Write a protein that binds this ligand. Structure first.
Ligand SMILES: Cc1c2c(c(O)c3c(O)cccc13)C(=O)[C@]1(O)C(=O)C(C(N)=O)=C(O)[C@@H](N(C)C)[C@@H]1C2
Ligand SMILES: Cc1c2c(c(O)c3c(O)cccc13)C(=O)[C@]1(O)C(=O)C(C(N)=O)=C(O)[C@@H](N(C)C)[C@@H]1C2
Ligand SMILES: [Cl-]
Ligand SMILES: [Cl-]
Ligand SMILES: [Cl-]
Ligand SMILES: [Cl-]
Lengths: 202, 202
């Protein structure tokens, strides 16, 4: 097959979706691509390189709300950005796992700079703006992680107390979206309390 | 070596700390234990079983704030519980990854029931209490994930714009704890706004 950047990543995304993060071995990638391993090594040195590139491409493909609308409130931007990030992370098997620990790629610099600048323009110190964005990112990654990994575990592997029993029905009543959106509102409002408080005790 | 539950888990925890979640293969576990693979299979059927058991034991060992103090506020319980959960997840390499997607084990039923009951006693519906606890869990897992995976990536693998440059210094100025604690306060306060609002628009 074609071994340009785009096609290697396509194939790796396919292989990820088919077999998860453990299936992504340079060995199985060579098979999908129809090549020998030294051929693949010329293009792709190791799993880390591959994963870093997949993380960027997952957002290029499916992260459709990466910048604020004109005059958009910071609350609304974080909300829309979070839902977009969640969507993108859920579109491939183990995609959140792929994203973990990545730092912004050079291709993403202008976008992440604008996000950070936008927060400071709305009254946050750089630090407080970053802690908000971070918290949103972290909560969204955890929520997605937990969902994706739960589904995996249900393909592999009775005296419940009553509240737990009900709580289990509730979590499993949708894909996680209800709990995620409730949490996201809580988070955004907590940032707001913090921001508006200025130097007052809060 | 001894192949009781306790010693198998000890060994697997050791192997996890030494080699991360990918190092935990039934094959490498058999070597640490000084046994052949069919011997190990009698005790441990597959990786999933192992991981589920490790997740429970990581909390038994290092999760020291799993229940509310007498008269403790719900805010203070969530705070103390979250910091405890974070500590426990950070005590082994890839321990958050080990915990992902696990549901409460029978050994943990009484504790999780009490957590859920405690929330409802403090004015939450079961559902809203669960969304709070979930959000805390998810945010803590993401935060820990991101930290642990970042450190891994720094063992494997220059025109930064200014805000990103500073933001990178800030994240890397500690182990993640500052951002985590700031986020946690934001989250808890957002739950409070939601709870006290009752049927009022908020
Ligand atoms: C600001 C920032 C971000 C991210 C990030 O990893 C990061 C970092 O590692 C160090 C310092 C700053 C940041 C994101 O992953 C990312 O997901 C991202 O790259 C990103 C994106 N590229 O559009 C986002 O939308 C952000 N959003 C999920 C809060 C977030 C922004
Ligand atoms: C309530 C609950 C919890 C957890 C959980 O996985 C869960 C679930 O999967 C379905 C329904 C309810 C819950 C936790 O993982 C756990 O980490 C947990 O087992 C736990 C523990 N065993 O002590 C905790 O302390 C909790 N805390 C991190 C918010 C949280 C509580
Ligand atoms: Cl071709
Ligand atoms: Cl080619
Ligand atoms: Cl022995
Ligand atoms: Cl034995």
């Amino acid at each position: 097959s074609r071994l340009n950047r785009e096609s290697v990543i396509d194939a790796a995304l396919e292989l990820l979706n088919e077999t998860g993060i453990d299936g992504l071995t340079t060995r199985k990638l060579a098979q999908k691509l129809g090549i020998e391993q030294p051929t693949l090594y010329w293009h792709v040195k190791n799993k880390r390189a591959l994963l870093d590139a997949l993380a960027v491409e997952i957002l290029a493909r499916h992260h459709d709300y990466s910048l604020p609308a004109a005059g958009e409130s910071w609350q609304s931007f974080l909300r829309n950005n979070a839902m977009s990030f969640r969507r993108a992370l859920l579109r491939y098997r183990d995609g959140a796992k792929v994203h973990l620990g990545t730092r912004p790629d050079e291709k993403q610099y202008d976008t992440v700079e604008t996000q950070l600048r936008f927060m400071t323009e709305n009254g946050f110190s750089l630090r407080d703006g970053l802690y908000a964005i971070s918290a949103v990112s972290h909560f969204t990654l955890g929520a997605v992680l937990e969902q994706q990994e739960h589904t995996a575990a249900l393909t592999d592997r009775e005296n419940l107390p009553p509240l737990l029993r009900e709580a289990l029905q509730i979590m499993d009543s949708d894909d996680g979206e209800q709990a995620f959106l409730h949490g996201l509102e809580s988070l955004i409002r907590g940032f707001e309390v913090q921001l508006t408080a200025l130097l007052q005790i809060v």
